[PDB]
Amino acid sequence: NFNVYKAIRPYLAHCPDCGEGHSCHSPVALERIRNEATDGTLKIQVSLQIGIK
């Protein structure tokens, strides 16, 4: 049942810019943006993981 992030050897987190001018410390730091889908939707890559405990 796709337990996909058990084997994630870690980076103890940080965000370079959450907005607000200055920096912060959170794994809401997105790493990259995928955009080339010709329909116009976006695939975004945040550093936190969702859904699976």
């Binding site: 103890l12 940080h14 410390h25 080339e36």
Partner: protein, 49 residues
């Protein structure tokens, strides 16, 4: 489309790392000196300068 591949940086704490020549397309490497790292509890390194 390409992918500008940026691997994880290599902070040599209290030491000067040297260039690992890797035969990669548009490969580029540089060891920057006199950096300061930091994290949750202040500095990521005990090292100073």
């Amino acid at each position: 489309e390409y992918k500008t591949v940026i691997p994880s940086p290599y902070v040599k704490c209290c030491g000067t790392a040297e260039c690992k020549d890797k035969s990669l397309p548009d490969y580029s490497c540089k060891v920057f000196t006199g950096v300061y790292p930091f994290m949750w509890g202040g500095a990521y390194c005990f090292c100073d300068t």
